[PDB]
Amino acid sequence: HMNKDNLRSPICCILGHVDTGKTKLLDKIRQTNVQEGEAGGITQQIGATYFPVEAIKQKTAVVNKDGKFEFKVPGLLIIDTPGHESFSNLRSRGSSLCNIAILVVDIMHGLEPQTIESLRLLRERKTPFVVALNKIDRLYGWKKIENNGFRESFALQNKAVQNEFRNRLDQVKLQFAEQGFNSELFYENKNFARYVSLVPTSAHTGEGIPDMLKLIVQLCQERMASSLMYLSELQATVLEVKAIEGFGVTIDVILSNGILREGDRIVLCGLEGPIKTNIRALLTPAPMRELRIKGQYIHHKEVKAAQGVKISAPGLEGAIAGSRLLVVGPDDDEEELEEEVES
């Protein structure tokens, strides 16, 4: 059960204080404009985007020029979350689902109250994480090269920008120390297993994003439990219940482990008790496009974990957000399964 056909795409949740750039970072990677469409310019829902490893390899090429860094994951599911204070429930749900995370910190502001909240979530679950120290283009006099690696661009800055960067970096490290986290600028980190790496980024210029992407793959491959690199028993969670044109009442689901198939008999929790139904359509967005955004869906016979899927099935009207979802297998009893989800 440790073969290429059995590889699992892990889950990375992005967390941070409001307006720190979490969505803008993902828009730069995806080449989308989700943030410009958001009411108030704020995220109000959990979003999910799947990144195939081919795309991650291309977007890290400028910090892997000789092609030698070994990519072992087949891809990565990235869960976007709200930073606004009123959405603590959704940060908790996203954090609960992830295997690794990116914590976004505005380099201009340092740690802020929902950063502290997010650090509590990360500590509680022992989640490996990297920090995107974002908005470096706001360093006064920053000269950009679009989508460059951070070190190459940093070497081209004037002495004032380099000094400002180091002063802000040192302040942020002291703040993380006050919260009980040792942190290092990523290329100064000699203990990747225990110290938090700080990777400076700009979602506007793209700089440092190649470093950030390489680092989250390294988190998957070198800090996450190895067993999570491979598919095991199905695990899935309902995110939302949504009525959709043509498909009727659907559920959006994070498939955390295992494999879902069209036609599967599924059991989940409903307002009046267990719901048992069959998957009529098993849908995803296009790769590198958001689950939380209306678009044309791709229909699949099979979806391997992790992914964000939309399921069309009769009888989903009472489904409960946060419910687990099970599949009735050949040796399962359908009625016995209903209780298991129940408790």
Ligand SMILES: Nc1nc2c(ncn2[C@@H]2O[C@H](COP(=O)(O)OP(=O)(O)OP(=O)(O)O)[C@@H](O)[C@H]2O)c(=O)[nH]1
């Ligand atoms: N100058 C600069 N502005 C940025 C950067 N990243 C984000 N912004 C701006 O900061 C504002 C907030 O960006 P968002 O992507 O909404 O941040 P967020 O963390 O997703 O916000 P919530 O999901 O609402 O918590 C927007 O106006 C962005 O254009 C950056 O690297 N540099």
Ligand SMILES: [Mg+2]
């Ligand atoms: Mg956002």
Ligand code: NA
């Ligand atoms: Na925002």
